[PDB]
């Protein structure tokens, strides 16, 4: 729905988290959980939760 870029590498901290590298383009699919957003990585094709402060708008 909106595209962001990852600011830092992130290793998943739950089984439902997305792992991603700095610079990945991430589509934000849901943001209702505040500091944790559901994202889809356009760079890798994977999906999961991310920390909202790890991304900035493209």
Curated annotation (Swiss-Prot):
The phosphorylated form is termed pp60c-src. S-nitrosylation is important for activation of its kinase activity. Expressed to high levels, and with a high degree of kinase activity, in certain fully differentiated cells such as neurons, platelets and macrophages. Isoform 1 is widely expressed. Isoform 2 is expressed only in the muscle. It is found in: Cell membrane; Mitochondrion inner membrane; Endosome membrane; Nucleus. Forms a complex with polyoma virus middle T antigen. Interacts with AFAP-110. Interacts with GJA1 and PXN. Belongs to the protein kinase superfamily. Tyr protein kinase family. SRC subfamily. Non-receptor protein tyrosine kinase which is activated following engagement of many different classes of cellular receptors including immune response receptors, integrins and other adhesion receptors, receptor protein tyrosine kinases, G protein-coupled receptors as well as cytokine receptors. Participates in signaling pathways that control a diverse spectrum of biological activities including gene transcription, immune response, cell adhesion, cell cycle progression, apoptosis, migration, and transformation. This is Proto-oncogene tyrosine-protein kinase Src. It comes from Gallus gallus. The chain holds residues 83 to 140 of 533 of the full protein.
